[PDB]
Amino acid sequence: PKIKTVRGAAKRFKKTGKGGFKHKHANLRHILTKKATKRKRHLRPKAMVSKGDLGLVIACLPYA
Amino acid sequence: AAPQK
Amino acid sequence: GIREKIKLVSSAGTGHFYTTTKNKRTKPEKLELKKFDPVVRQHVIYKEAKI
Amino acid sequence: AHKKAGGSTRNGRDSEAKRLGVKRFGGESVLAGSIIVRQRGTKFHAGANVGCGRDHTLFAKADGKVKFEVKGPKNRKFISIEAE
């Protein structure tokens, strides 16, 4: 049968031109008053999945 | 059955 | 501790607000400060409000 | 006889090591922004073309070669950058 996508990963990574994955940063959901604005500002932009992680992501997203 | 150690 | 969270609301018509922690017991009078409002792009008075 | 229970230690705690110390040595070429020393307090002081951060981290404000030197009446250790 077809491989099934891990649907929880499809909600969290998106593929990019050269095949890498962008993701949203952690730590920016709650408990925000105590975090410095410098720290919070750097967490807004999307980020690229690291080298050691790509193997795990690609397994979950066979049809990306 | 037997006595055990 | 008694240091409790509050928010400061822009006195302009914008919705923009800051959050901060206040010792409710020892300083019962409202905090009030001029701060930058990035919606109007001006320094404006901000006043304490409930979180 | 009876095997007798031991007690317990009251110690057993430590913190994570912080990787302080010199990160670029004398004569080493650096780019602007490069951290040269991680410190607690100013064990080294900022010389020419060197900045000091809020946690006393010394960093390059210009490209050049790191120069360590001793200066002043207190014989304090200063780090400076010399243009290449």
Binding site: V6, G8, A9, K11, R12, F13, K14, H23, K24, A26, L28, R29, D53, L56, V57, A59, C60 | - | - | -
Partner: protein
Amino acid sequence: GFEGGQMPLYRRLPKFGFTSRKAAITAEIRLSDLAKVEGGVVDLNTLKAANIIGIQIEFAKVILAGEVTTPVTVRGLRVTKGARAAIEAAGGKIEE
């Protein structure tokens, strides 16, 4: 995605965004495709008949990819700023 019981990477990270339903009914056309239609008039019906776009498509943009040499008239499509210049240089015209 199992990691020995550590919280796995696809669950440390927040979900984001949403899926547009309008995106699925939108297509992009290349300049090199404009020569493939029959009859020199480019519109959604003509591009569908050429099997250049799917039957469900309702919106299409011509974009500056490849090149076009024959004159063409583009009707009812949207056109990028760069694609417009290319069609005009070929002696075509865009209308709406």
